[PDB]
Design a protein around this ligand. Structure first.
Ligand SMILES: CC(C)(c1ccc(O)cc1)c1ccc(O)cc1
Ligand SMILES: CC(C)(c1ccc(O)cc1)c1ccc(O)cc1
Lengths: 225, 225
């Protein structure tokens, strides 16, 4: 099929581990510390991954940073959604960190994790493919609506190149549904909504000061609130 | 062109007036009272308008209510965006109520109104047509991601019928841009984001108790928070 899609597939990063501390008693603080720690390390991987998107590394460093600062939370959440597709009512943050309803309750994440499960259920019913996943991830990056973009034309071109890839892929692989590309795009508002709420939630947790957070995650949280 | 589009055009409601109280001194409280009062009356008009969308009135009353309860804020904001297209840095809430930067500052709405202006600027550059406007409004209603839907198949069919109309319209009227429909759909995440933030803001203002709010607006605010 489409070359941008196959390129995005080979650029897809390796899974990383949560490694929750086995000497520490389970609590809300432990789960949150674990999750924030995992996200901090994934952000490093996401920065590396973005460099493989055609056109991205030719934007100015400022525009690259602006896109990443706007989109990072949506990209993280899309990841856990995709990892969770073949599970039921469980969220696979990592192979060694799967949250069910009870742990979500414990961590104070029930409402947020329930919103993420709503995303999972929608992609389950549409039978989201890996090809579609990696392309939406790139589109979420490019369509992240940063207020601080310099070369808007270049960013729009980036959006168009990725949108075309999605369109091309869907035309060749899903002839039975000529509106599948548009259906995929219409899942983006729920991703943006959930991401907006997630940024607010973890910012409150930053302010409360009981959960340790690393520099990158904090920096990224700061730029979005 | 497409019949659903022409039908949505004739179903488009009359503009209503803000009628700010001319005996009351300008303040944050006056602006907010005016805006909330305007929204309350527009919600009545939006309920009436929805009945004209093909398929909508055949959903159960519960599913109709669920869609409206999820989508109402996006529909209000899309309205002010459309009214503001031919203005510069001004938001036309009504013909007798146009907010500039200073009044937004006064009302404590600078950040929220700046997000709405970001929407305006994006549709200006794409040259949003009235045909496209009324169709996106209907799509925002149908794609509102309520958690409490009963007949999901019927709602998805509603989404598909409206998405097809957009697709049909764009194919016939904008042959020069075969991705225009998808570009329109990719504006929806910014609308959802702004609407999510707006619901949080006015809910805080509800809690503070200094701004009088009518029953419908309060009821709708309650169902979304
Ligand atoms: C940002 C967050 C810590 C996270 C961590 C890791 C991850 O892969 C995806 C998301 C997160 C967000 C929302 C949420 O409900 C749980 C965890
Ligand atoms: C909901 C609100 C009072 C409104 C009132 C009327 C309207 O047409 C659109 C929006 C509103 C939301 C966000 C905002 O920044 C100003 C006013």
């Amino acid at each position: 099929y489409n070359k941008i899609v196959s390129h995005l597939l080979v650029a897809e990063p390796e899974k990383i581990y949560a490694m929750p501390d086995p000497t520490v008693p389970d609590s809300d603080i432990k789960a949150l510390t674990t999750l924030c720690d995992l996200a901090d390390r994934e952000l490093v991987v996401i920065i590396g991954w973005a460099k493989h998107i055609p056109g991205f590394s030719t934007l100015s460093l400022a525009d690259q940073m602006s896109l990443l600062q706007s989109a990072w939370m949506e990209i993280l959440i899309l990841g856990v959604v995709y990892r969770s597709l073949s599970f039921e009512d469980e969220l696979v943050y990592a192979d060694d960190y799967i949250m069910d309803e009870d742990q979500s309750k414990l961590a104070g994440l029930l409402d947020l994790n329930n919103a993420i499960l709503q995303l999972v259920k929608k992609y389950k019913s549409m039978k989201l493919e890996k090809e579609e996943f990696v392309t939406l991830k790139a589109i979420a990056l490019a369509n992240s609506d940063s207020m601080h973009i310099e070369d808007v034309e270049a960013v729009q071109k980036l959006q168009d190149v990725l949108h075309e890839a999605l369109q091309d892929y869907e035309a060749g692989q899903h002839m039975e549904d000529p509106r599948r590309a548009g259906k995929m795009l219409m899942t983006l508002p729920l991703l943006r909504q959930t991401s907006t709420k997630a940024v607010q939630h973890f910012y409150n947790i930053k302010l409360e000061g009981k959960v340790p957070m690393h520099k990158l995650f904090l920096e990224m949280l700061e730029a979005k609130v």
